[PDB]
């Protein structure tokens, strides 16, 4: 497994019951968010760790056909059956780098 891209972002999940975003893992702050590629089965996943204490706040697969939504210039999002993930990037450049890596990953799947 190899990191193909990384960006700084505050990782959020959507609390549908209350119609609100909450910090992934319980506390607000920036994480280093990677896309990892695993050879052999050709899989990708997003893995993010809090800069402060290395808490893993996101670890989710990227399936073929995932719909990655660039809601704003610095907030991007996607879903699975259980929850909706959001990345609040530290800059538009961080967001564009991550998005381009994600979209190219979806082309390799």
């Amino acid at each position: 497994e190899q990191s193909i891209c990384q960006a700084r972002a505050a990782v959020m999940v959507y609390d549908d019951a209350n119609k609100k975003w909450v910090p992934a893992g319980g506390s607000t702050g920036f994480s280093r968010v990677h896309i990892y590629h695993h050879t052999g089965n050709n899989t990708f996943r997003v893995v993010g760790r809090k800069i402060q204490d290395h808490q893993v706040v996101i670890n989710c697969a990227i399936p073929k056909g995932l719909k990655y939504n660039q809601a704003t210039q610095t907030f991007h999002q996607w879903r699975d059956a259980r929850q909706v993930y959001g990345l609040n990037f530290g800059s538009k450049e961080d967001a564009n780098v991550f998005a381009s890596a994600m979209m190219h990953a979806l082309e390799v799947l």
Partner: peptide, 4 residues
């Protein structure tokens, strides 16, 4: 997707 939900809004921000």
């Amino acid at each position: 997707x939900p809004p921000x």
